[PDB]
């Protein structure tokens, strides 16, 4: 109200409204789902078009051979944060001959977002990210909020109507965590999860975007006729 003019101001109840408004941009964004087993991790994203002449906005970005994310909210902010992750993954490989741990990648993203919430002149990031990866401790899934809060999960969803997919994953938890050594079945579970968030529209061949990373699987994005198999 009187306390939402900038990110450097607490409200009388201890809230940061600019951060909360940045969180609101994610809710307006298109739904994206993340889930994993013990061998693989999967991203599923519903891409959004402007109209029938336009392309469908890409949602998934590769960060390294073993790591990548999906976005919901301001796409240019995702480009800034994914570029930063690419650099940090790259620094780890060049300097230490070491693949960057997914948990450490989350810590770096948290700290980068935090600096934009405590200083004058800046603004919070207006995007949410779901990071998947396979490192020395197996498969991982992270959820990033521009408040700085990063959380490791078995599965999750962000964007508009994400609550439907999140409840489904909460039911299916015991099933999909056991889908080891079967990439197609894990993706099926993700496609079925994101379907719980659709209304009026359904998953078409230029609508759907899928990514996967695993034990002997580099981070690869599937679009177009490569996802027709799962429709």
């Amino acid at each position: 109200n009187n306390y939402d003019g900038d990110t450097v101001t607490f409200s009388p109840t201890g809230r940061l409204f600019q951060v909360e408004y940045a969180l609101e941009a994610i809710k307006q964004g298109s739904v994206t789902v993340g889930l994993r087993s013990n061998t693989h991790a999967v991203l599923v994203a519903l891409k959004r078009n402007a109209d029938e002449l336009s392309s469908y906005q890409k949602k998934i970005i590769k960060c390294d051979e073993h790591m990548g994310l999906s976005l919901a909210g301001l796409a240019p902010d995702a480009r800034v944060l994914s570029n930063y992750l690419r650099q940090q993954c790259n620094y780890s490989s060049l300097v230490f001959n070491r693949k960057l741990a997914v948990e450490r990648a989350g810590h770096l993203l948290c700290d980068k977002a935090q600096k934009n919430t405590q200083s004058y002149g800046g603004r919070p990031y207006g995007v949410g990210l779901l990071i998947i990866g396979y490192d020395k401790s197996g498969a991982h899934l992270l959820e990033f909020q521009p408040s700085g809060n990063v959380t490791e999960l078995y599965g999750t969803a962000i964007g508009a109507r994400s609550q439907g997919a999140k409840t489904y994953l909460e039911r299916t938890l015991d099933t999909f965590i056991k889908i080891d050594g079967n990439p197609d079945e894990l993706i099926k579970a993700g496609v079925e999860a994101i379907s719980q968030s659709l209304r009026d529209e359904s998953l078409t061949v230029d609508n759907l975007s899928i990514a996967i990373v695993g034990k002997d699987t580099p981070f690869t994005i599937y679009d177009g006729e490569a996802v027709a198999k799962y429709i």
Binding site: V8, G14, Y120, T151, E170
Partner: protein
């Protein structure tokens, strides 16, 4: 009025309302505690399980500084991480120049001065965390608690977050009933109980217990996380006391 719209502005009372509003964010956070024992310190924190999809034991909250100091905080988690990152830089530069690991009172002032600096200007926001920290140095065990204003003192026991009143009452009983002191292993058990008791203010969702400790006899003065059998033993002791 308007005195509360900008950081570092004195109200007619002589108060900094923006710092007082940061305290509200701390009071909204989960319960974290610290217990000073005979030859060390124990830290414990309540981790709210928002969903079944949270991977157990993975979202670690307690943080180590150097190899002998533990830090835990309640409020805005990112703010606490920022403070610990600074603490790690302060500890590194101290050890670089003076060789010896940073003493706990020395480390306490480093955090204190940094947090206080964020109450001097309107171009920065105060920290939305109260931090409980400490460890073992050459003069023995030390436990501290640091507020958004930059204010800190030494403690026998400390608590912050939503269930701080409950926790404080429990800590006060331990101080009265043990003037001679508490052992490190006893403190771990007691820390588990107090977090379980303080969870009544957050009773809607279930939680996960996380404990760490630095002890001269039990951990060689190094900070370590309580894991496996010792953690389960503390959880059992805690569950027995609430029933």
């Amino acid at each position: 009025t308007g005195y509360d719209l900008s950081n570092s502005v004195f109200s007619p009372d002589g108060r900094n309302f923006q710092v007082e509003y940061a305290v509200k964010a701390v009071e909204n956070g989960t319960t974290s505690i610290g217990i000073k024992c005979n030859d060390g310190v124990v830290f414990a924190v309540e981790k709210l399980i928002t969903s079944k999809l949270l991977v157990p034991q993975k979202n670690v909250k307690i943080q180590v500084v150097d190899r002998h100091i533990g830090c835990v905080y309640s409020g805005l988690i990112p703010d606490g991480r920022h403070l610990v990152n600074r603490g790690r830089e302060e500890a590194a530069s101290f050890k670089k120049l003076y060789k010896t690991p940073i003493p706990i009172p020395a480390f306490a002032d480093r955090l204190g001065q940094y947090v206080q600096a964020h109450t001097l200007y309107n171009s920065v926001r105060p920290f939305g965390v109260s931090t409980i920290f400490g460890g073992v140095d050459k003069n023995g065990a030390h436990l501290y608690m640091l507020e958004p204003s930059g204010s800190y003192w030494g403690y026998k026991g400390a608590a912050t977050g939503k269930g701080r009143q409950s926790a404080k009452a429990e800590l006060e009983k331990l101080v009265d009933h043990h003037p001679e002191g508490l052992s490190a292993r006893e403190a771990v058990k007691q820390a588990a109980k107090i977090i379980y008791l303080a969870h009544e203010d957050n009773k809607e969702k279930d939680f996960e217990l996380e404990i760490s400790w630095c002890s001269l006899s039990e951990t060689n003065g190094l900070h370590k996380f309580v894991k496996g059998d010792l953690l389960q033993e503390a959880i059992d002791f805690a569950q027995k006391e609430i029933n």
